[PDB]
């Protein structure tokens, strides 16, 4: 609550006698007007300390600068009472409803659990789509990345399938007793426009009535921004991990994760190693895709989903490298795809959930899915060859057998991949594949077994 502030940079502020404080803390600071702002507790040395004002900066004076000690580490209140609440960045009551009932003020970062507990996520999951459930599904707790474009229909295709998602234990042989549906979404650096496109999907159909919001606009303060995700992130845990519910964490443009980052080191003196960024991102970032998985004994499992855009769609950047290193999959979007009108414009092989190849098929989703999942993959792409070779010979200039492998691709991207807002049940989604496969007389598919095709086909 002291005064005498020396050395002030932007939303930063130093204060002596910092032996009562400790890095990892925050308190509200008051200049002259007595305005209540804030500031994180950094460098608590003998001489002075380091604080980071919530707001941008304007409002710090030389005379007064006392501070009301909030709490070394602050954490929002957790509970099951948040089935439609709304919060931004830090995550404070903006939805109008009463301050969330605090159950336990857990650290926004409880770090990973016993690695011995962690199990392989293999509970099949639908998303109201075909292509994104057949060729590449998503297993419970599986941290699946989504390579998006920095200005692509991302923002949309994001929240689009968001609500579409629906967990189906039924097909496995269980009910929704221990398998509840919990939707958590948190963005950052959002345009005033977009900040409004979001709030829309929830209000659509029974979407917000079972979810909580979080998103620190880029114009907002850069402080809550970083942690912004960690909030509901650490909070989803109390859901599936503490009670055994089933949560879905979905990142959003880590552009923020790093832009915001730069400031921390840019001030903290944290020298940026490669690509002009902090020489300890891997680590700090790792702690991210760790909040997803499964433990021995608990069925409750939260599924994790990263989603970001590169600087110029360069995978050589951290934004991609990092992920493409810890994430168990890959799912990008191409200009091409969308240019023709494909929506969702999602490529084939370029996108795929690394660990959704085992949690499918027998018992899980559609027995024959086992081989069905690797059929349309090698079979489809096979046609993408006679797709750019028209100018070579022509339409009828090509054989029947291989030419046929063409009509497929077009009927495949236009109808199969571009599925817009539609919501295809995990089963309504598998059928389609079959249907398309009919192009080639029963006997041309070398991927699946004659057994399965000689039936579903």
């Amino acid at each position: 609550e002291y005064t005498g502030i020396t050395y002030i940079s932007g939303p930063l502020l130093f204060v002596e006698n910092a032996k009562d404080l400790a890095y990892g803390a925050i308190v509200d600071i008051k200049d002259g007007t007595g305005r209540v702002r804030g500031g994180q507790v950094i460098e608590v040395s003998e001489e002075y300390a380091v604080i980071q004002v919530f707001e941008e900066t304007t409002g710090l004076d030389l005379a007064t600068t006392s501070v009301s000690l909030v709490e070394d580490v602050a954490r929002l209140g957790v509970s099951k009472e948040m089935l439609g609440r709304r919060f931004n960045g830090i995550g404070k009551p903006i939805d109008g409803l009463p301050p969330i009932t605090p159950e336990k003020r857990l650290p926004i970062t409880g770090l990973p659990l016993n690695p011995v507990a962690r199990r392989k996520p293999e509970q099949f999951i639908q998303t109201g789509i075909s292509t994104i459930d057949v060729m590449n599904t998503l297993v419970r707790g599986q941290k699946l990345p989504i390579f998006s474009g920095s200005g692509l229909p991302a923002n949309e295709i994001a929240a689009q399938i968001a609500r579409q998602a629906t967990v189906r234990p039924d097909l496995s042989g269980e009910g929704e007793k221990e398998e509840p549906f919990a939707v958590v979404f948190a963005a950052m650096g959002i345009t005033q426009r977009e900040l409004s496109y979001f709030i829309q999907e929830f209000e659509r159909t029974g979407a917000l009535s079972r979810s909580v919001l979080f998103l620190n606009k880029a114009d907002d303060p850069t402080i809550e921004r970083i942690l912004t995700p960690r909030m509901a992130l650490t909070v989803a845990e109390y859901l599936a991990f503490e009670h055994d519910y089933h949560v879905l964490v979905i990142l959003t443009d880590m552009t923020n994760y790093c832009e915001a980052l730069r400031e921390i080191g840019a001030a903290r003196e944290e020298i940026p190693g490669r690509r002009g960024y902090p020489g300890y991102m891997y680590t700090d970032l790792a702690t991210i895709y760790e909040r997803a998985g499964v433990v021995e004994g608990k069925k409750g499992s939260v599924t994790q989903i990263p989603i970001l855009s590169m600087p110029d769609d360069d995978r050589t950047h951290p934004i991609p490298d990092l992920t493409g290193y810890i994430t168990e999959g890959q799912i990008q979007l191409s200009r091409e795809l969308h240019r023709k009108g494909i929506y969702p414009p999602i490529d084939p092989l370029p996108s795929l959930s690394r660990l959704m190849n085992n949690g499918v098929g027998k018992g899980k989703t559609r027995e024959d899915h086992k081989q069905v999942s690797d059929q349309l993959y090698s079979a489809y792409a096979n046609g993408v060859d006679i797709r750019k070779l028209v100018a070579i010979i022509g339409e009828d200039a090509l054989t029947e057998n291989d030419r046929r492998y063409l009509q497929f691709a077009d009927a495949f991207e236009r109808f199969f991949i571009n599925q817009g807002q539609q919501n295809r049940s995990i089963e309504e989604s598998l059928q389609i594949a079959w249907a398309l496969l009919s192009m080639l007389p029963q006997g041309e598919l070398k991927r699946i077994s004659k057994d399965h095709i000689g039936k579903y086909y």
Partner: protein, 577 residues
Amino acid sequence: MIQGVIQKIAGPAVIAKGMLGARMYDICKVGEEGLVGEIIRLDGDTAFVQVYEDTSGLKVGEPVVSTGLPLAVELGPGMLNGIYDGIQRPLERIREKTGIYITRGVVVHALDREKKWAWTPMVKPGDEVRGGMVLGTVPEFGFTHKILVPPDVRGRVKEVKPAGEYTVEEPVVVLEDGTELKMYHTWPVRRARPVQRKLDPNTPFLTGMRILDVLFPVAMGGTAAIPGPFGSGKTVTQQSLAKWSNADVVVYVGCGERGNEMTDVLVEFPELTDPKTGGPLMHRTVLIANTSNMPVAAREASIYVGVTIAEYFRDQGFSVALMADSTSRWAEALREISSRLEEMPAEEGYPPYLAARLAAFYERAGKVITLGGEEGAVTIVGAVSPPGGDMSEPVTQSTLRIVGAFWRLDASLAFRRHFPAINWNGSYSLFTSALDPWYRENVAEDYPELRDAISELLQREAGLQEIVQLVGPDALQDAERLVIEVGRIIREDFLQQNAYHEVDAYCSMKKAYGIMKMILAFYKEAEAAIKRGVSIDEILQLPVLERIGRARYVSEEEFPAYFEEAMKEIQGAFKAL
């Protein structure tokens, strides 16, 4: 404010002392002249002296006086028609009181205290006002310029003068508090204007550019951006933007714009036809241009200076349209802070206030309804100037994720025959999705259809483009030059728009809309010409093809019937051959 003198003399930024409560970001006074300073850092009693204009005439121990509050820009009638620096200072008065060069120390009111603007008070004496509410109707050409009650100055009116002529200093409205709601009202720049509420952008904006409003448009006050290498028309490309296009209120400001790159709209904008008021656009235009050689820090004022004026109008429900002449120069100044401040270099060799002052400033105002009554939006596009032109420069990404509908500026593009000179693919748009409502009705219920199926080619045509750079017309088949050339002409006469032509400088829907069909037909007929067997060879030299390329130069008047006459010659001079 605070009262003290220079404590420790230094190059262009000194160190004052005896400073108490010198809050961060505050206007002040330094030097026995008027080199107004700003509290840009604190250290107990001393604060880092900020010097706007270059200092070559000052001594060790001179003026040092703050304010106590975050600056203070004086907004009010009389700001229109006249040159004004990035500090709301009318250079007109400078040239008139100094000479041919720009003398420093000279600073006069930014509002018209002398001039008497016919003020009209309609505030019922016996009620309470709120900062942001209308105060009456002020005469100011073919448009409407109300006077917002300074925010938080909500009191209780008690009288109302007659409707005659009252300056921005004379008593125009009074309240029970000893205050007076003059034609002007004090408001800080570092702080935005509390409007009534936030609104969604569903209305597309038009400026004549057939590359924006056509397929790549934004919002009736959204956010956008466009780079520009060393001399890419980005500076002047702001002429036919607010002049030709509709803009409730025009506001031009540029960061350190090369005197020569700044004298491109300085005298040109003056003779601009106005479709509402009539004469020069200089009727609503503000002009806040700032030459580079200008005080390196003025380069900063410029911005935070045009941001609030755009608001003061927007709140009232004025879709203010502001455009920054090369937003990149602000950066060279902003990061220049470091050199003079020896501040711990942030990442990317630039300052840390990336997001803090990028997104905050790039989203300050944008399509927001307020107490005014109408819906005031804000559409602004800073044209980054990448030194090497590198698209991965701090300023490039620094604006990314923040502003949609991004665009690129190639080098041989405008140098050749392409105008605007932007990247074909590299330039995509996401606002056009929800921009269909307005288009559907205005244009047609199937317009987003005739425009999306075309972009289908413009971006799919690449399918061959690539193979082209892999072989050429050698192994061309029949669908081959189909697209290639199609897209080809599409950029020579369809895309390139001579903004420097008689009328083509602007094109409406029926203009934009039709053309996009002119070719289409040929395409349609091309599909059965060659497929039937017709050799593209005679198809190539079709005389009517030359007709489809003289459509850009036509006006909205002649256009309608003009194209319809060829729409017949088409199916006729093709299906035939």
